[PDB]
Every structure is written in structure tokens, then in C-alpha cells.
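thought: user wants a sequence for this fold. calling inverse folding tool.
action: design(structure=
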């Protein structure tokens, strides 16, 4: 017959916003799926709030499209935002579905329609995503919603990664006996054939593939993008839990403590750069508490240095040395999501996102503080004295022999001695110095 394409569709939104209903309506035309044209669409499913989060962070590569539900009457709520945020960071195309239109009037729907249009424009990649009001109870516009899911899937660029090593997380696992266990999850990268030797991590055991169940059917082979049931031998189900990962023996996956990411910030104004900051880092399917130290990379003409952020976020660089409290399974290039989930669900909880560049402790990145103090040149009859670089005489004496330049005048000098008990200073610089000139002290420090 015809060749099918395997799609994963996520459904996101506030609870009570018509998630489950929208699912049932789609499923009727674990594993719940449906066909549209030659698309086999498997729903990406988790019960709610923080689960769908853990779901996107992990399965981002394979989630082709998402539906974001928002109640017609009461419009977007707090959860509606964070899902939108997350989907935007991971560049997952969305359709906004306005649910319970049967329970609202034209005016009310049009309102919520526009509130979402305003919101969508405030996002990078979702800038203009279609919006449909439907009523799952009534059937209102449900037909159009399917035609849209097709159109979207037709446009979106779907890249299945077959070429690399087999990489697959494990959602649920359940036993049969001591010599077997059945694990489920959607394949990220690679390929599996029945009768292959793989391994579970982090516990690092070696198992063989007894059965591949895909789409209520047994197959000899699965590919990336396929959500498959898998029975493997050499592991009991008790050892395999929420964070486990089934992958081949050529795996690039590592068990990691220190993570160095290139971080893009979600909202600038909610962001703060006070280093050594306690957050919850999303890697793979887990959420580990962490400590972050933001820095930028700076070439001084000879050697590139890692400088603690000058608090300027002008220029997109926010490398972040993370130090995790627990361990985690990661690869270089894996998208990482910084959250603050300690906070109540009533406020937006995403402190950004980023790609993993390196696995390296701060102690090796050789962090350095860009250091600037500022004084002025005060000159009486025949004497020049720099003021403000030092508070007292002892502080000033520490500065003797340092590098000093004058702002705007393209001129250099060196600071020789101390004058007075109030921390004034003297210096020998190139001539043509004037009263009330600006003195910029410049040096590198060992940070923290």
C-alpha cells in the first residue's frame, strides 16, 4: 500500500483547558495514535504540568508538532506560558487550539484569539502560528484542526537521525519474569534490529532485543522517531526507572557531573547574572539541582579568557558552568533547560535554555574577573594627584606600579607612589594631562 510517515504530536496547556478531550477526539478516527493522510501520528503523552516538561526536554528532537490548548472563556493561564516558552526554545512548531468554544460567545473567542496573537508575536520561532477555536464536545472546527495538522506537518522539516548510534530513553518499564523486562520509549537517534546487543544506563548493563512492538504490531526493525514497545533480557524491571536510557555500545552518552553550556536567556528582565546561583537543571528526562556561574568568552589578542559576566547581556554569549548535585546522562550538543521549579506554579518558571558545549568544572575553565576601578586627576599648582582609585593609604600602596590609562585621550602611564592618608596617589604618565581627567585602572582577577 502507501508509505506512512511516523509523527509525534504533543498536547500542551493548563489543566482543565481541554487537553484530554482533544486527545480522545483525535485518537478516535501508553500508546495512543491516529492517522491523517499518510501520517501515523502518535500522541506525546504525560498526565500534566511538570511531566510534559520532562517530556519535551528529552524528546525534543523527535516531537514534530505541538498543540497548545487554551480555554476560550478564561484565556491563557500560567502553565500556558511555560509550555509556550519551552516549545519556542526547542523550536517545535505549534498550533494554538482554543478549546470549549461551545461554552463561549463570538466576542469572547475573538478576545482570546487576539490575546494569543499578541503573545505569539513575543516569541522567537512561533512568531506566527495558526489559531483555531474548536469544541471537542460539539465537533466545531475539529475538521479544520485536522486539515491544519496536515498542512503544518507538510511544511515542517522533519529530520529523522538514522545515521548515528542508537539512543533511546525509557519512559516506563514492566516485568514478566526474572529473565525478562519490557521497556517503552520513543527512539531519538539510530536504528535497532531484533536480536541486537544494547545497554541500559546509568546502571550500565548489557541486554539483547527480544521483541520490537510498534503500532500494535511486531517488527524486525525500528528507527528514530518510532515510539516502540521493547522486550529485552538481562535486566529486571526494578532497576529501571524514570531516568534510564537504552543505547548502543558505540554510544557517545556520558554520565556527567559538570556541565558547560552556551545559554540563551528566555526573558531578559526576569534574568539575573549574580553568579554561583542555585537552580534546577533539566537534562534528558531528569531535573537535578545545580549551581551556575555565568561567563563570557573574551579574546584579548593572544589568549581567549573566560570572564565572569560583566552583567551586560548585549552580545548573546552567556556560557554557564554548571555543577550538578546529582549525576546525569548527557552528550555534547544536547539542549539543556534551566528552570526554577521551586517557585509556585502561578509564575513563569523558565530561567532559560542552552546547548551543552563542554563537560568541565569551573576550576579548569580558569575563570577570571575583569577588574575596573575609576579615579580622577586632580592637579593643583605643580602637582598631579589621582583620586578615587583608593580609599586609604594602605589600599593605595597596593596599587603602586599598576597600569593606568586616561579615558578618551589615547594616553598611557604608570602609578608610582602614595600621597596622603586619605588614599590619594601619584603617577608618571605621558604629558598633556589635565585637571578632572578620567583614570581607568585595568587588571584581571582570580574570580571566586
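)
observation: tool returned 448 residues.
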Amino acid at each position: 500500500h502507501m508509505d506512512f510517515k511516523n509523527i509525534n504530536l504533543g498536547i500542551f496547556g493548563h489543566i482543565d483547558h481541554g487537553k484530554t478531550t482533544l486527545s480522545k477526539v483525535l485518537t478516535e478516527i501508553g500508546f495512543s495514535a491516529f492517522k491523517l493522510e499518510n501520517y501515523r501520528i502518535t500522541l506525546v503523552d504525560a498526565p500534566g504540568h511538570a511531566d510534559l516538561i520532562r517530556a519535551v526536554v528529552s524528546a525534543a528532537d523527535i516531537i514534530d508538532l505541538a498543540l497548545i490548548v487554551v480555554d476560550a472563556k478564561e484565556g491563557p493561564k500560567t502553565q500556558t506560558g511555560e509550555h509556550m516558552l519551552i516549545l519556542d526554545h526547542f523550536n517545535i512548531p505549534i498550533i494554538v487550539v482554543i478549546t470549549k468554544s461551545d461554552n463561549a460567545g463570538t466576542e469572547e473567542i475573538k478576545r482570546t484569539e487576539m490575546i494569543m496573537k499578541s503573545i505569539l508575536q513575543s516569541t522567537h520561532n512561533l512568531k506566527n502560528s495558526s489559531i483555531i477555536p474548536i469544541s471537542a464536545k460539539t465537533g466545531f472546527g475539529v475538521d479544520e484542526l485536522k486539515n491544519l495538522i496536515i498542512t503544518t506537518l507538510n511544511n515542517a522539516e522533519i529530520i529523522r537521525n538514522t545515521e548515528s548510534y542508537f539512543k533511546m530513553p525509557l519512559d516506563h518499564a514492566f516485568p514478566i519474569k526474572g529473565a525478562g523486562t519490557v521497556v517503552t520509549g520513543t527512539i531519538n537517534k539510530g536504528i535497532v534490529k531484533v536480536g541486537d546487543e544494547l545497554k541500559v544506563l546509568p546502571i550500565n548493563m548489557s541486554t539483547k532485543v527480544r521483541s520490537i512492538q510498534y503500532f500494535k504490531e511486531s517488527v524486525m526493525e525500528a528507527k528514530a522517531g518510532d515510539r516502540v514497545g521493547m522486550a529485552i533480557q538481562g535486566v529486571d524491571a526494578k532497576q529501571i526507572y524514570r531516568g534510564c536510557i537504552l543505547t548502543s555500545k558505540d554510544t557517545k552518552l556520558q554520565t556527567v557531573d559538570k556541565i558547560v553550556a552556551k545559554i540563551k536567556i528566555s526573558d531578559i528582565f526576569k534574568y539575573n547574572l549574580t553568579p554561583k546561583m542555585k537552580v534546577h537543571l533539566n537534562v534528558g528526562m531528569l531535573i537535578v539541582p545545580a549551581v551556575a556561574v555565568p561567563f563570557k568568552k573574551v579574546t584579548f589578542g593572544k589568549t581567549e579568557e573566560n570572564i565572569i559576566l560583566n552583567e551586560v547581556i548585549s552580545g548573546n554569549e552567556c556560557y554557564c558552568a554548571f555543577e550538578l548535585e546529582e549525576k546525569v546522562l548527557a552528550e555534547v550538543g544536547d539542549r539543556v533547560l534551566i528552570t526554577r521549579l521551586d517557585l509556585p506554579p502561578t509564575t513563569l518558571r523558565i530561567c532559560g535554555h542552552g546547548l551543552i558545549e563542554e563537560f568541565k568544572p569551573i576550576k579548569d575553565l580558569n575563570i577570571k574577573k575583569e577588574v575596573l576601578r575609576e579615579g580622577k586627576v586632580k592637579i593643583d599648582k605643580g602637582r598631579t594627584v589621582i583620586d578615587g582609585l583608593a580609599q586609604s593609604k594602605v589600599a593605595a600602596e597596593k596599587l603602586i606600579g599598576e597600569e593606568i590609562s586616561i579615558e578618551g585621550k589615547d594616553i598611557v602611564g604608570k602609578i608610582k607612589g602614595t600621597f596622603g592618608t586619605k588614599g590619594l596617589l601619584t603617577a608618571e604618565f605621558s604629558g598633556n594631562v589635565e585637571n578632572r581627567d578620567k583614570v581607568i585602572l585595568n587588571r584581571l582577577r582570580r574570580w571566586g
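thought: summarizing for user.
answer: Here is the designed sequence. The first strand starts at residue 5 and ends at 13.
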